[PDB]
Design a protein around this nucleic acid. Structure first.
Lengths: 77, 218, 325
RNA sequence: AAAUCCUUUAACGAGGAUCCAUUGGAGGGCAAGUCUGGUGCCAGCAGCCGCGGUAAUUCCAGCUCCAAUAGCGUAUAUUAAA
RNA sequence: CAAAGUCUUUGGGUUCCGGGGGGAGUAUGGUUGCAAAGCUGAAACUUAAAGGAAUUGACGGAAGGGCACCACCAGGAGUGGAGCCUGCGGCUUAAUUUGACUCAACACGGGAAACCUCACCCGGCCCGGACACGGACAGGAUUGACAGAUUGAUAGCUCUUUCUCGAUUCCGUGGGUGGUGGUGCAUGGCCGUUCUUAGUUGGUGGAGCGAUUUGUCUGGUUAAUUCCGAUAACGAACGAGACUCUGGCAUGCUAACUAGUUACGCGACCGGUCGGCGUAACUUCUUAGAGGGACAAGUGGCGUUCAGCCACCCGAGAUUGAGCAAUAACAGGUCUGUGAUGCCCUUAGAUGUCCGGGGCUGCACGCGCGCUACACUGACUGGCUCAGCGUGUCCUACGCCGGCAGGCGCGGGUAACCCGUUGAACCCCAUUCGUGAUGGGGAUCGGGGAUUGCAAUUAUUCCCCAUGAACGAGGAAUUCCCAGUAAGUGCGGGUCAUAAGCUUGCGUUGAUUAAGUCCCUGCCCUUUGUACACCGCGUCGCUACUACCGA
């Protein structure tokens, strides 16, 4: 999920979730590579996938031109 | 292999009693299942009317046991109805069948219009009253069929009644009361006095009183 | 830990309502006294049994749920979180026989001590005896702190929980040496006379109920055993506590006493042993209360039909019977 | 009336990828699946009883089967059931 | 219920009146009323039910009953306090794996792990990817690799170096094996507990529409649905009981050179003593087989003269101790014992596997199991002497050499033979110290020495010097127990390359107290009652939307 150490330390307050519906959150990072201890509500299946959700606000591009070219007659392929 | 216990039973075993009718004539109680199974033989089919599972309140908690309602019927004569409760379902069934063979009654079969051919219907409009269920059988004309609820339809079919207008009153939903009501109605067909049975009944010797010398040896 | 922070309050409090009146509380009753959400509380109960929050009971006819040891503990901390006293958990825990000591931290980060009573008759009575214990201990803790005594500062009480001032030290039983034995001895002797002046005898004033703060300050804890001086054997419990301290300092630190206090002073201090006429707005309030109670009683009966477990057991056997026929 | 349609008749007109049958249902009532995938008290279904909170016989699909059949569902008025 | 009967075999006359529950006996109108009110009397809307009879008894905060040293009483020994051994949490750590959490977790996982085990952490290796098909490949697919660099590693693992290896492959598609990986809340089996507590269940008959009941009980009695006996019941099956092992006793029986005794001859030394030597008598000692034996039998008390209890004579014995243990259950433990297993994850820079290294043992701490103690009934020092269950190809004797750990050499034992007459420790008889932190108690440490094993630094163990501490019988609380029984004391097995402060057995010394009760923590009966009711959470703040009133 991460590859540095302070990547995990940056996203510490981000609450994890799980594909099979477990709701967790990270505890310690261990490795110098991206490894982390994570607490959960229940016990995870090994067949599982852990995943965190990150959000930013996005606003559209300013591409406004009132001119639009005249189309040729439409036909089918 | 059958080894009889009762006096009646022993008589049956041999050839001393010819039909089931000689038992019914003297109103003797049939205490053994084999007697019925001997006289009517293979002609007795059966219908499992219901298997209702009940949970019995025990000090061990709750365990499952099944109540079976079985209506045994030789067609064109004799019906019976049995109710048993047991651990297994097959056990419940066989117990009910045994019990229903002990309860075999004859039905009187009558005629609707002029008495041409074989009897087909209930001889006169009878009733069977069993704990808020009131079953009424009514003579129907030949070929009408049994116009009834499914359960007394079964029971009347296995009695050998061809056609009967039924009408039930009260809580007909409770199956035991319904079936038992209809059985009670059908039994009552022989118990009803018409002008047909006005002749003074000449008394034959009872199966016991006739074969007394043969019962000395056993 | 505490992740779930909505429906878990209402359902667990509803157990506590039934616990005060009856033993094992049926799931039918719970939803009626927790009327805010209907039907979906039975899956909350299945999440409560995952933790040590509630226990299931299906004995013979008794069907329902009872509150556990740890489940009763979570309810107090959930109330203390709303009173803004507890936020996170400190890990230094002294697991005792009558109570458990849990270090707690507030919004500030200031560390306090929390007591949780663990009295261990059915579990219903055991989780009611712990209720009376905290209310009694907090009563003495308030009574002594106001009257100049060196006790932990009372903060808040919730059912069985007591939040106190964090005095960190070692109990007197596991102390090797004291730098000044005489000054510590005279401090302790004063505290027996102090209590007797307020009309109190400790009863069990031993080395097992005293804590030293940096070997300077004697701290007193554990107060459910305290007796009045009106008692006939008042001087016996007074002298037994004196001899217990007299011999201990002679045993452990080899200090013999020059001062022998046997003064009976009752009482120079506070006796702590006792320790058109109707306006339309009112018409509105009264009509409202009538209309709420009519709706609440009907919702109870809707929730009492949840039995869902009874229908599940009946369906399983019928499938077995039909297949075998 | 003049037509049309029917009837009557020349010729052409049938091998399943057609000249292809539909609507409702498949826990109980009630005839027919503890089949497979998806969903996870959500979406939804369900006249009533109820189904769904991770093995769903009840949801959405696939397959399979059942009832009616060129018809079959649904809402309502009404009669028997009463 | 003799009417509530003469009702589907439905009609003697006749008046009033009900049609799921609520809303609601509310509004509105009328009418009577001095008034309070009465009579008459809706709808909108809401709800799958409201309810009546009967029946078992999950729960009583019922009352009674009875039961148990995992309860108490009468007691004995402790724990808890010290020091340490190990388990749990807690906290640091790369990791200090994991399961277990009141009895029913916490010397538990035969969990006494140096490596291994090993799951955990770090660095590396291997392929142990069966198979089908495609690609390549014989003008070689691929295999093995000295040197030198790197590398902990004579790791061809990578690189240079250029030699071998003959299809034994290799790359992919699928996709099989494998995991001490996840789920014991997806399963089996085994086990734990409820419960070591005592019942469970038909068949037939009887009662009731049926659920159900009777059997399964007034009373006495018993651990008890046991027994006597009463009786709409009568009979059963299953388990406990009836038994299996062990122990007690036999001068009776079957027997012994792989146990003997007796005796004789020989020997030795003061008629003796000898486990010193060999023949004959035989089973008492010793082994172990059958068959006895004790059954509340005898006598006397008390008991509805009844099951039984009590007391004592004869008796070895007038309770020997365990094992095995029901109907049902807990969503008790256990994928970490299984080649028993379902899914899901991870499968070749692997969660497969081996390799080296660490860790599981870490330390302010609480909680627990346990050893040694706190001394004079004691320790040290001699001398004296006495077992049993056992184990043995690793047990060991016998000679010598080193105080001691141990070394050297020769023997016995695959076993009633050798260890071994298994010459065990408390205990017994003398010497020493004498109320004191003492010679009691030995923690914590410095030096050496010897073994075990590829390795003892995180002392594996064992010895010999030093060092020589807390510890003065321990509060609140609690634990165990009734006769060869607590407790003292050693021994042997398991664990084990090296090893028992744990455990499972064995003896040896050996008691005081009670032979009772329902007070306590609980548990078990019996009797009786039974399918969360009512009266005591709110205040204000701006916006829109709904429905009433209204100038």
């Amino acid at each position: 999920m991460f590859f540095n150490r302070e990547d995990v330390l940056w996203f510490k307050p981000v609450e994890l979730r799980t594909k099979w519906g477990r709701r967790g959150h990270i505890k310690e990072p261990l490795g110098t590579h991206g490894h982390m201890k994570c607490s959960f509500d229940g016990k995870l299946k090994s067949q599982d996938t852990v995943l965190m959700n990150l959000y930013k606000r996005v606003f559209p591009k300013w591409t406004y031109d009132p001119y639009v070219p005249e189309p040729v007659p439409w036909l089918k392929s | 292999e059958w080894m009889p216990v009762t006096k009646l039973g022993r008589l049956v075993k041999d050839m001393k009693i010819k039909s089931l009718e000689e038992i019914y004539l003297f109103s003797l109680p049939i205490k053994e299942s084999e007697i019925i199974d001997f006289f009517l033989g293979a002609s007795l089919k059966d219908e499992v009317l219901k298997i209702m599972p009940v949970q019995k309140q025990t000090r061990a908690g709750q365990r499952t046991r099944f109540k079976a309602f079985v209506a045994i019927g030789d067609y064109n004569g004799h019906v019976g109805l049995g109710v048993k409760c047991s651990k297994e379902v097959a056990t419940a069934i066989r117990g009910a069948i045994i019990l229903a063979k002990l309860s075999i009654v004859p039905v009187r079969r009558g005629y609707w219009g002029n008495k041409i051919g074989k009897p087909h219907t209930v001889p006169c409009k009878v009733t069977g009253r069993c704990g808020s269920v009131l079953v009424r059988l009514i003579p129907a004309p030949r070929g009408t069929g049994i116009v009834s609820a499914p359960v007394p339809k079964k029971l009347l079919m296995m009695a050998g009644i061809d056609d009967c207008y039924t009408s039930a009153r009260g809580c007909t939903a409770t199956l035991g009361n319904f079936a038992k009501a209809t059985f009670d109605a059908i039994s009552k067909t022989y118990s009803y006095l018409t002008p047909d049975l006005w002749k003074e009944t000449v008394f034959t010797k009872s199966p016991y009183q006739e074969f007394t010398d043969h019962l000395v040896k056993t | 830990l505490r992740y779930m922070s909505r429906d878990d309050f209402r359902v667990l409090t509803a157990v506590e309502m039934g616990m005060k009146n009856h033993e094992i509380v049926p799931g039918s009753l719970i939803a009626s006294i927790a009327s805010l959400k209907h039907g979906g509380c039975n899956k909350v109960l299945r999440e409560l049994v995952k933790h040590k929050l509630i226990a299931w009971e299906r004995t013979k006819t008794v069907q329902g749920y009872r509150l556990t040891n740890a489940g009763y503990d979570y309810l107090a901390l959930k109330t203390l979180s709303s009173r803004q006293v507890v936020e996170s958990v400190g890990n230094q825990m002294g697991v005792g026989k009558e109570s458990d000591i849990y270090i707690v931290a507030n919004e500030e980060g200031q560390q306090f001590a929390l007591k949780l009573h663990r009295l261990g008759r059915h579990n219903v009575s055991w989780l009611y005896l712990s209720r009376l214990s905290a209310m009694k201990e907090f009563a003495y803790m308030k009574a002594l702190y106001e009257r100049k005594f060196p006790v932990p500062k009372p903060i808040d009480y919730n059912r069985h929980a007591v939040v106190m001032e964090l005095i960190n030290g070692y109990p007197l039983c596991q102390i090797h040496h004291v730098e000044d034995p005489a000054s510590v001895y005279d401090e302790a002797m004063e505290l027996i006379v102090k209590l007797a002046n307020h009309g109190l005898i400790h009863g069990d004033f031993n080395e097992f109920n005293l804590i030293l703060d940096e070997s300077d300050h004697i701290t007193m804890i554990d107060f459910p055993q305290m007796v009045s001086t009106s008692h006939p054997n008042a001087e016996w419990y007074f002298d037994r506590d004196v001899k217990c301290i007299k011999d201990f300092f002679m045993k452990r630190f080899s200090y013999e006493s020059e001062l022998f206090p046997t003064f009976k002073d009752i009482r120079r201090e506070d006796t702590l042993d006792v320790e058109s006429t109707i306006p339309p707005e009112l018409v509105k309030q009264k009509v409202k209360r009538q209309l709420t109670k009519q709706q609440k009683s009907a919702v109870r009966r809707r929730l009492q039909k949840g039995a869902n477990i009874f229908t599940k057991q009946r369906r399983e056997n019928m499938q077995n019977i039909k297949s075998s026929l």
